[PDB]
Amino acid sequence: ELPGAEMGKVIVRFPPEASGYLHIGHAKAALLNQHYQVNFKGKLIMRFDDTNPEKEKEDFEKVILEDVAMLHIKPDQFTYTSDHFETIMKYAEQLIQEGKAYVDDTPAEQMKAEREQRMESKHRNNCVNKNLQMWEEMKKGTEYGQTCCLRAKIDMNSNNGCMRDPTLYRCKNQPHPRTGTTYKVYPTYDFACPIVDSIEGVTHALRTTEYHDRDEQFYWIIEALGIRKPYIWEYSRLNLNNTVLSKRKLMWFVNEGLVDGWDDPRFPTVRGVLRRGMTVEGLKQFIAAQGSSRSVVNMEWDKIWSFNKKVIDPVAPRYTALLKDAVVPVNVPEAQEEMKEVAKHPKNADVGLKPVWYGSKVLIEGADAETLTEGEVVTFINWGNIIITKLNRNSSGKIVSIDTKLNLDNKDFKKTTKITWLAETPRAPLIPTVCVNYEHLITKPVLGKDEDFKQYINRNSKQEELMLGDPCLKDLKKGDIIQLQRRGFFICDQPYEPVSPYSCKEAPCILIYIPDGH
């Protein structure tokens, strides 16, 4: 919950940077923000942080709006940091004119040295007029202004590095995507953020606990300017095992070709994670269950998948896929070709019915075949009890064929083995399907500090298996979540396509295994 929060009067913002793709960490922040917006009937600002005309591009902006849409997040307002450039500049000039900010031409590396050694720069005590003259050089973009930055005059002696006169503004002759060349001077995030949260009316600024040092800085700027003070609510950063979240680390997988790209189902981007079979609601319930916790736990991926498994289980239709290579033909001579409709779901009659086809020519898993004995009563799922009569083997002792007798008046289902099966009939041809299983990209769950993820790359993180699918799979569409009986939950990544005139082959239904929490 939120201190200082009133119904209808909460205002939160999600302020990504459009430097790349949203990942599950950004997903948490956006969903936590949305949670407070919905539960308090407040407003959610989606603010592009475009303080930097060099770290953003129009390219990731669109990406980011799609990711937010995919999370079913509907911001009430869309703003940019650049929308307030004018006002931010004026607050900088206010601080200069009050001795609270000065301009420094000290080269950056020396500047970080002195900042490191609690050493005041030569400029800290400049009179207002000399500061205003150097500030003029940055505004005009002169080559001398370009080496100058505006610093806040706080405390070079603070334990809080973030308080040792932080840079508020820099001079970049760069043209800006939305403001063009109006400004040769650009505020830092540290400086822009408290101001824009105050302007836009933000009552609760959610930051990850890793920003905690900057809260002191945040509030100094607010007070030094004397403006609306937003409340900072701190939630724990998402630490997932076997997982890295840094763009520079994720990028290495892309560049090394270990991964398909940013929407790869092994990536923790929201794109990849949804492709993997995570649902928004499963994500939404996981965030809500731990809410605003400040303890930075090492989260296990399984704990999210268990929340997801609860969401898809009640509604995912059940279908059958058999491992193509090992399938064993079964003779059911008494059976006639017919079709009956049968429940798609074992506990929720809402999901509806599927057609099942029966006939004398049937296929079962080789793994199941090798566990059968002659004279055993076996339940063929959605059919009934069938007596195994002959197990036909070849010269090597491999079952190559199974003969059966129907036993459908025997309605005893207590101790029978219950196996999946598919009929071979031209009236309902089997659908070629590929099952894809993904593993983690990093084999070590928790990296200690000073440890390099590149030593624990999983080089076998994708496996594909060729299946004979349920005829109903031909109508799956990308995104449909289903259950392969006795195998698990799967999401359709690519649908089946009928024989092409150009390639003379079908395209298989591609199903990705959805981790369930075990």
Partner: protein, 280 residues
Amino acid sequence: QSMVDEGVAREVINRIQKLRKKRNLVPDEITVYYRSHPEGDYLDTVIKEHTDFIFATIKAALKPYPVPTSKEVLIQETTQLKGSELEITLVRGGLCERVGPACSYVNLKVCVNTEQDGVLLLENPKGDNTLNLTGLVDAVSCIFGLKNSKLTVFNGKTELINKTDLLSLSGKTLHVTTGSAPALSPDALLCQYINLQLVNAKPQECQKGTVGTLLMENPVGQNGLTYHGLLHETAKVFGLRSRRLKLFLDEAETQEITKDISMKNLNMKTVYVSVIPTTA
């Protein structure tokens, strides 16, 4: 006088490489097209007889006009030489060697209700998804719009069996009828086609081969392949439907196949398929 004509051929050669130096091009796969306007006159004679010599010292090929509508012109100069006018155009990438179909195929004459011509690839990519007689009948039914209506496949005058090895008939023409061997077998594929060579990456969806073939029409004159269709079908062949693909006319990857290519240009050419990361 052959040393006189060789010295003129060297002047064309010198003309060509000065153009290479104009576009900062450094030996860069290129092609050189030429036109000596007073046709068959002196300078045109020289350049044709000495084409091997020119090719040997300018390590690019030397074909005459016209430049393909598909290639991007690097430079185009017209100067004079020994009473002819001499047009040189330099274009990116080497040539486009036409090759036979990479996958085993079968020409199809389908006489049920008129005669229809087409091709059926028996594998795709090469080495995978090899076809059964039953698979062939199904494929013929989908593509040609037939029901499994007493559908009989004839190799010449024999009828094929669920045991016939279709691959061993790879060059041949088969007859699909309603149960009545025909009378009366072409050589060339009845349909335009392209070959596909995967270069960047390995096929997925448990496929295996790195070379494939796409017909550009099936049956003949029906179902013209479009540019966007080629992208999708390329992906289907190798199991790269999730991936972003770039198609190139050379293996150097400099003549990129583009949405304003003319599809007929591609016929019998090997298209080179490159997988790139899905970024934004």
